[PDB]
Design a protein around this ligand. Structure first.
Ligand SMILES: [Zn+2]
Length: 266
């Protein structure tokens, strides 16, 4: 078993699928977690990115990607799994064809806005990511790929998911999507996939207490994300536990995943 996890950002795979990853490694699978939007970034940073760096406990002009890459390696090392850091820039670092930043801070507004841009630029990014995933599939030869459902509709999550669907389809490799956490605690769960793909029946995993502990300890390695993830209740792990309990009342901890299959008539 060769399991390739494809994470949009440096944290998503562990938050969403860390128990699954840790399980797979125990069961003797060869596990690699490739993060798409782990591309090196350097100043000048946008006001929005500088604001994010501050929220992450860094100075505005710190090399945030380096800090986050080191966190990811610690987290994945804790799960006893391999890492691979991709070349693509997080949405907060990307520019539009016209030279504007992709993402902007709006005075008063907490949530960051995305600037309008052409169909083509979106298409091009997904195409590039798909190219890199195809290359990694050739190199690593996975028997299973897992990536995000993009619950919560983060553009980087949607780009990752779509690129993985295209690449795995072309390469004829089985693929599953995980339930994005903690996003799924606040969103309906429904997603719109690219034409021709659909979700099969959910699997809700059941993992031993030791794996839950390992997952949660691994999440803690992402120091930069802790304040953001815990919120003003300081209750990330409680919310994750409650979410799992909802989906398995007579169970222990678990993670929801769906197989992705081809639609009828496609
Ligand atoms: Zn993410």
């Amino acid at each position: 078993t060769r399991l390739l996890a494809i994470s949009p950002h440096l944290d998503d795979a562990v938050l969403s699928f860390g128990a699954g990853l840790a399980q797979a490694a125990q069961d003797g699978a060869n596990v690699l977690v490739y993060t798409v939007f782990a591309g090196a970034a350097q100043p000048p940073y946008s006001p929005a990115a500088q604001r994010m760096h501050t929220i992450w406990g860094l100075a505005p002009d710190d090399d945030a990607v380096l800090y986050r890459r080191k966190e990811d390696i610690a987290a994945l090392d804790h799960l006893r799994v391999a890492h691979r850091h991709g070349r693509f820039l997080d949405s907060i670092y990307r520019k539009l064809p016209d030279g504007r930043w992709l993402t902007a801070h709006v005075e008063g507004r907490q949530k960051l806005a995305v600037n309008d841009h052409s169909p083509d630029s979106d298409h091009d990014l997904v195409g590039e990511v798909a190219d890199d995933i195809r290359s990694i599939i050739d190199e690593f030869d996975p028997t299973l790929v897992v990536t995000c459902a993009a619950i919560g509709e983060h553009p980087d999550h949607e780009a990752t998911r779509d690129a993985a669907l295209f690449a795995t389809h072309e390469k004829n490799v089985p693929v599953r999507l995980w339930e994005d956490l903690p996003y799924a605690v606040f969103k309906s769960g429904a997603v719109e996939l690219p034409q021709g793909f659909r979700l099969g029946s959910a699997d809700v995993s059941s993992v031993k207490p030791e794996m839950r502990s390992q997952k949660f300890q691994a999440v803690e390695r992402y120091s930069s994300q802790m304040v953001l993830l815990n919120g003003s209740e300081n209750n990330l792990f409680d919310r994750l536990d409650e979410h799992a309990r909802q989906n398995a009342p007579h169970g222990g901890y678990g993670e929801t995943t769906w197989p992705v299959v081809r639609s009828d008539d496609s």
